[PDB]
Amino acid sequence: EQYTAKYKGRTFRNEKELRDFIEKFKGR
Numbered sequence: 001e002q003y004t005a006k007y008k009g010r011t012f013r014n015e016k017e018l019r020d021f022i023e024k025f026k027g028r
Contacts, residue, residue, distance in 0.1 A: 005012040008025065012018040 002013045
């Protein structure tokens with residue numbers, strides 16, 4: 001059970017995903 005980081009109603013359990021999410025949904 002890795003970290004449960006949540007951003008847009010989606011917990012992140014993989015650095016590959018988070019490194020691609022915040023990088024894509026940076027907020028514009």
